[PDB]
Write a protein that binds this DNA or RNA. Structure first.
Length: 270
DNA sequence: CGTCCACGTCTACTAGACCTGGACGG
């Protein structure tokens, strides 16, 4: 999941749970390093919101539910494969590591946080991760300021392709979005970040918002989409650069691949 | 059978580590 997938996931939770009531406990699958979720209620509603590469769930007891519960918040990161699914209670799609169960009036479902590689995390406390910058989709102006007020930061000495993954200033931008963003403007991926940003103080900071936004409007599951699935053709078809034939690719300093076209830029690995 | 790759953080000292599974090579 990148920012758009986080957003689509939060909006899926909100749509798919609009008319559901949950009940019972919050069940974490075995070998679940992540913490148990201490929360029981006989009738609760679930909602979500996204920020950057994080997603917040809110568990909200209906009036009169038992045990007494104050609404609880949980914040998820998706790692390389996190996702959410609403499934029939007994047709659990492994490796569903956290499970929320509908309550009886109706067919029994489980909302699951499904994470094959188990790189995802959650933490108790509905708090955004300290240090993540603002959301490039939902807090653009803040996002933009937090970049321009901070170019002295040594994060900006790095190639622009690397700086774009720094979640302290580009919360939500991942590996496919960085290629697509840089490609739209033909900025070499290994130009220096500060040089490309100081020019501002659509440009690069605007495309950091509207590019991931385009993916959200495709709807569907974005990068998460499955072959042959209908939203997977959409996504593949939207990509112009990331993994496309006729593009170059190189390894950045952390071993992540940056796709691009043409000039690799001054700071390339050589 | 294998090796390599993948939408990202974490954390223990800039590499590894943490994971499963799909594509494809022999």
């Amino acid at each position: 999941p990148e920012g758009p997938e986080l957003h689509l996931a939060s909006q899926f939770v909100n749509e798919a749970c609009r008319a559901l009531v949950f009940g019972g406990c919050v069940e974490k699958s075995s070998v679940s390093r992540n913490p148990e979720v201490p929360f029981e209620s006989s009738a609760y509603r679930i909602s979500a919101s996204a920020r950057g590469k994080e997603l917040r769930l809110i568990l909200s007891p209906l009036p009169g539910a038992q045990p007494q519960q104050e609404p609880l918040a949980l914040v998820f990161r998706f790692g390389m494969s996190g996702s959410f699914q609403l499934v029939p209670r007994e047709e659990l799609p492994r490796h569903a590591h956290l499970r929320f169960y509908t309550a009886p009036p109706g067919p029994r479902l489980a909302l699951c946080f499904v994470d094959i590689r188990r790189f995802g995390r959650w933490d108790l406390g509905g708090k955004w991760q300290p240090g993540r910058g603002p959301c490039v989709l939902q807090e653009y102006q803040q996002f933009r300021e937090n970049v321009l007020r901070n170019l002295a930061d040594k994060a900006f000495d790095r190639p622009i392709c690397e700086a774009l993954l720094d979640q302290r200033f580009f919360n939500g931008i991942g590996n496919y979005l960085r290629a697509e963003i840089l490609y739209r403007l033909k900025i070499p991926p290994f130009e220096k970040a500060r040089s490309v940003l100081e020019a501002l103080q659509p440009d690069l900071l605007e495309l950091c918002h509207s590019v991931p936004k385009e993916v959200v409007q495709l709807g569907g599951r974005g990068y998460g989409s499955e072959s042959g699935e209908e939203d997977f053709a959409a996504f593949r078809a939207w990509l112009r650069c990331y993994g496309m034939p006729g593009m170059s690719s190189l390894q950045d300093r952390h071993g992540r691949t940056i796709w691009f076209q043409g000039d690799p830029g001054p700071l390339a690995p050589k």
